[PDB]
Design a protein around this ligand. Structure first.
Ligand SMILES: OC[C@H]1O[C@H](O[C@H]2[C@H](O)[C@@H](O)[C@@H](O)O[C@@H]2CO)[C@H](O)[C@@H](O)[C@@H]1O
Length: 93
């Protein structure tokens, strides 16, 4: 299985990282500061695949203090791929 997630980077952000927890099925889960670099995709879009996973809660961050959603707010729940530009889409919008 595995979730591919694409994320449109806000202009003022550094390169996005994907933080995730509540993996199902359970898979290794990085620390906030060790959340992985999303690979550059096309233009503003970046991407990362969580291996081994049907569902996840996730937050986007950079190496700075930016994150979406806010500090402490629950991760976005996916399900399925994958495109977030401020709202979620099954296809590139
Ligand atoms: O790990 C569960 C926890 O993850 C998310 O928390 C982040 C938080 O949003 C960051 O600002 C920073 O404090 O690191 C935390 C993870 O260690 C969710 O926001 C939170 O709801 C969830 O419980």
């Amino acid at each position: 299985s595995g979730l591919t997630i694409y994320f449109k980077k806000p202009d003022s952000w550094g390169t996005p990282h994907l933080y995730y927890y509540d993996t199902n099925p359970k898979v290794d889960e990085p620390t906030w500061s060790e959340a992985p670099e999303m690979e550059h995709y096309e233009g503003d879009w970046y991407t990362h695949t969580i291996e081994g996973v049907e569902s996840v809660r996730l937050l986007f961050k950079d190496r700075g203090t930016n994150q979406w959603p806010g500090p402490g707010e629950p991760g976005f729940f996916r399900d399925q791929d994958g495109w977030f530009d401020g709202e979620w889409h099954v296809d590139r919008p």
